[PDB]
Give the backbone structure.
Amino acid sequence: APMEVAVCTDSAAPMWSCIVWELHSGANLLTYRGGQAGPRGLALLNGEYLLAAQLGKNYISAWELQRKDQLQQKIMCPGPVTCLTASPNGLYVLAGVAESIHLWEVSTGNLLVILSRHYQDVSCLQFTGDSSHFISGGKDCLVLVWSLCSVLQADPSRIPAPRHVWSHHALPITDLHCGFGGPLARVATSSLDQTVKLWEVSSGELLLSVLFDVSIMAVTMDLAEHHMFCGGSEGSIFQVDLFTWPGQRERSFHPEQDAGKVFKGHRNQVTCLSVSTDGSVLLSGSHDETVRLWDVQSKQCIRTVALKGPVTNAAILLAPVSMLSSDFRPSLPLPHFNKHLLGGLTLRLGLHQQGSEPSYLDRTEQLQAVLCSTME
Amino acid sequence: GIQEDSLKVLDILLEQYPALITGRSSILLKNFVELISQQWRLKVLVRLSKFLQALADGSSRGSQPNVSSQFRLR
């Protein structure tokens, strides 16, 4: 059976700063010691390094996964870092500085491009589940869909432009959720105007405009797109059913049922949501200093782990080999992350054939052929 | 003089049923070219613009499967 962890961070950090505890046991696995984290500012890099932003300050820390102490490498930026996100494959680390979308490369360590189209701060940054598109949104009520192909191989005198410009909200964005896929995925942007819209990343069209009662501050979706758990600004965790589908494009929550589709038990905002793999336990942070697991099938609480201070980042992962093992020295050291705009790839060969070794019957047949040829 | 008499007739029924004048036009557009191929030419152009305007005015006036295809084996 697999193992599921729940990474949690607090905005006060008296003793620890990123506690990793087992889901169905509640016991700690790994802790970390250092500066305070930042909202939407945690991202595991290649399953080896736990990069984290800093609250207010302008730089990014870096913890090796099997090490309780901060490393001596600090990514530095020319302005207050707002959000961070590492690409799923692990090749690119992409962060947002004020209104810029600084993009790095893990292999060489260079700073490829500095994209800049938002008119105000950038407050959410997500990567499509195949690292082909990355969606960025900010406090200017704009959600843009970039493309990792066009923004990388663009001429230095071409000023790359976003593939899609989604401008339907009337208030700052707060969270996004790009599902699996690629050029066929679906985004679930949510703003402060009490709406949660589900877009399409292939053609760029609206599909749903659920309008809630309180401002939405976090949206997560089931991996098969069956439920859309939208957080609230008062504590409730509303739930939309995408497979019932009453059959319109601009719904409203109260006509879409109530009191049987609302998780309740929180007393302040919920700026964190994540659904487990199978889709039976939901982990939600808050601002009332509590991270609690729900029971999506029965809308009941399970445990009420209480942190210190507001909860910034909280998510459910599938525990890699890193956390299970005890030493796991990283394959490659983290390079020197540049802060100025610009061959030489640094990589380990012999990984495109891992396991492509001859089978027992193949070797036996080759040996028998050699014997027969020698006999003649 | 005969042609100008008929040319006046065209402006008469153009006003009343402008939609159906454009149905069997075909030949009539050529006929305008035939006579021209100054002042006599001018009077032709007055309702020729009205003639061309007739075609312009006459011709001018997610939650769905979107699975109908326009490919036909023919």
About this structure: Chain B touches chain A at residues 62-63 (CB under 8 Å). Residues 14 and 26 of chain B are 16 Å apart (CA to CA). The radius of gyration of chain B is 19 Å. The helical segments of chain B are 2-16, 18-21, 27-36, 39-60.
